[PDB]
């Protein structure tokens, strides 16, 4: 019931938030399904950050994989999860979010 309030803009998600729970809200900038790893990148500013939210079999609750499957590029989502400081491909930004909740506000 009722999506939680955004605590941070995607640009504010930095390695110094490591271990903190955050809520980000914005649109699906990118989807990657590699089997055991699925990654949804969320942006909330044009030309902005695209924070990767990582789903990993064995780690992420199963029910969130069912929600990932309903996702499309440009859907508006709200995601609650824990920040993890870690090297990203092609970015100096260095963060991912391990999700505990994924809400789909609406389906662009």
């Amino acid at each position: 019931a009722v999506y939680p309030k955004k605590t941070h803009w995607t640009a504010e998600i930095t390695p110094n938030l490591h271990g903190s729970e955050v809520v980000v809200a914005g649109w699906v900038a990118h989807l990657g399904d590699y089997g055991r790893v699925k990654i949804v990148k969320v942006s909330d500013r044009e030309g902005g950050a695209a924070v990767p939210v990582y789903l990993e079999r064995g780690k992420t609750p199963d029910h969130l994989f069912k929600v990932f499957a309903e996702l499309s590029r440009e859907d508006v989502v709200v995601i609650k999860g824990i920040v993890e400081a870690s090297e990203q491909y092609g970015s100096a930004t260095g963060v991912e979010i391990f999700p505990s909740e994924i809400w789909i506000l609406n389906k662009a």
Binding site: G32, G35, V37, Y89
Partner: protein
């Protein structure tokens, strides 16, 4: 086929993986070790109806076609059976598409869990490349 470590390193190097998307060759060798134990015939069925195939455990939902996974996209345009042979060409061609998808080698859970942040170049030590 079960590859030797140096033997797989040389074959990956001939296939252009050293520094492919900025990933040095030991990354690829370390990934194969933890994904397949260097066994080209490795096949692992997941609870979600997809299966992972070959030396780099490529998944049947998006990447190869095994004819039995719902929502199959076949982005590498290859049947999954091609990924089980003694020769790594097909697995490599498909891994290059996966590593270019926009998340680098974070697409392989065993690379995240066992390779990332470790001495990856140790995987090619003593190999005559």
């Amino acid at each position: 086929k079960v590859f030797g470590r140096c033997e797989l390193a040389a074959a990956m190097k001939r296939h252009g993986l050293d520094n492919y998307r900025g990933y040095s060759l030991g990354n690829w060798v370390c990934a194969a070790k933890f994904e397949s134990n260097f066994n080209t015939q490795a096949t692992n069925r997941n609870t979600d109806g997809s299966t992972d195939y070959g030396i780099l455990q490529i998944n049947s939902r998006w990447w190869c076609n095994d004819g039995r996974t719902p929502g199959s996209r076949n982005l590498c345009n290859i049947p999954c059976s091609a990924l089980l042979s003694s020769d790594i060409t097909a697995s490599v061609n498909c891994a290059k598409k996966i590593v270019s998808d926009g998340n680098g080698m974070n697409a392989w859970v065993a690379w995240r869990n066992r390779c990332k942040g470790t001495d990856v170049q140790a995987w090619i030590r003593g190999c005559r490349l």
